[PDB]
Amino acid sequence: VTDYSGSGVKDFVFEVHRGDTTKVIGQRLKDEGVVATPSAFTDAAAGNQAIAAIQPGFYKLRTKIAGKEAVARLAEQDNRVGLLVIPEGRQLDDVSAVSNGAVTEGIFTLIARASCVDLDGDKHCVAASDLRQAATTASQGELDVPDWASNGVNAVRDDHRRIEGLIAAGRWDFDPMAEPEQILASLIRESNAQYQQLGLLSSDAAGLSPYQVLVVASLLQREAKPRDFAKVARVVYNRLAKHQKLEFDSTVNYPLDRQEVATTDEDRERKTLWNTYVSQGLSGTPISSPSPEALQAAERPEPGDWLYFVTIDAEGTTLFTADYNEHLANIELAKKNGILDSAR
């Protein structure tokens, strides 16, 4: 049957849909002018495991090519485009290390990098600043902000940080040729489905909204090691109940876009929507994209009366207590064991 020869005509982005079989992909490849007949694709794909296991997503292909060439291009990992990984605890912005270490790239930078497609020579990317602007100004309906987050987003005006926490840690696909608003919206929709699957909307923890649970998880992700998440969650709720400020360093560092570092009394005094040295209560928005385990801890805090915690040694032991004098003793223990500076 008819099957194209030669090197093709035009590079473009092709989407494999969820539920597409090899046969259906062959039909769609014919309809988009990639292969001359569907069986040109399916014959060449027979017994190919890369094609059999192909994932829904976006793929750089070329028009008017041979079936075996279409198969090779689809099976080549490098032609995958709009595939994004957001590691746990990332922010929207890049975060500098004043610890003398390297920059930590944020979600905008990672989306932009994931968006790049080489089309007939032209490298085509969405720019991080365009994603940031769309986060700053697009309407909630345009970003598909979920209902449980609507009021939290609304209280933060003309700041991209209004959508913090809404793009979850995980692995996502997005159309690299769509507008910045639609890219952000699809990410937020996929994240909302994951958050639902991870229990964010169906939690029975008394007196907490889903948005508040997300905020707590984002704090835990930045302040504690995974082993301690559940206990730190209890500390947070105990302090909220006793109207004691959280005094989390990560809430000071978050808007300065800087990594885990000690904070001065000057920094702790700056009034922001997030600073928990200044104000009682939770941060106004999440301060990071939390891991699934931080979410589970925020939903199911370990029972206990602790109000204080500090890491005291090299192996990461963390002592929790409800007694302030014991907490002072544990702080000094961390200083003698070398973990914490003798003076701030």
Automatic annotation (TrEMBL):
Location of this chain's protein in the cell: Cell membrane
Reaction catalysis annotation: a peptidoglycan chain = a peptidoglycan chain with N-acetyl-1,6-anhydromuramyl-[peptide] at the reducing end + a peptidoglycan chain with N-acetylglucosamine at the non-reducing end
A cellular component annotation (GO) from this entry: plasma membrane
Its membrane topology: Single-pass membrane protein
A biological process term (GO) from this entry: peptidoglycan biosynthetic process
Molecular-function GO term, any one: lytic endotransglycosylase activity
Record site: Important for catalytic activity: E223
Principal subcellular localisation of the protein: membrane
Keywords, sorted A to Z: Cell membrane, Cell wall biogenesis/degradation, Lyase, Membrane, Transmembrane, Transmembrane helix
Listed EC numbers: 4.2.2.29
Disulfide bridge partners, by residue number: C116-C125
Function: Functions as a peptidoglycan terminase that cleaves nascent peptidoglycan strands endolytically to terminate their elongation.
Family (UniProt): Belongs to the transglycosylase MltG family.
Name of this protein: Endolytic murein transglycosylase
Organism per entry: Mycobacteroides abscessus
